[PDB]
TrEMBL record, chain A:
<protein>
    <submittedName>
        <fullName>Major head protein</fullName>
    </submittedName>
</protein>
Amino acid sequence: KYLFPKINETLLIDIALGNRFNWLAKEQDFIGQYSEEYVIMDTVPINMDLS
Amino acid sequence: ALLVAKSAKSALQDFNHDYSKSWTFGDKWDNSNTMFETFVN
């Protein structure tokens, strides 16, 4: 009843925590900052009013 | 009154106006008092 107690082990519980997305992860190469895209809008055609 | 004299559904209404209506439903052509008297039909 006079000894300081003892610790026998620790185990370092760790979990790995995935992403659920990285098939979305494509890789640019760190140059430039502005990127953009664009579309053309629709044009409904018109009747032939020959007058 | 007569459907034949009605110029506003003819084929000239779609080429003077830029917009026209795309589909059609036909008509119920008559030969009553026209230049197309027909005894049987």
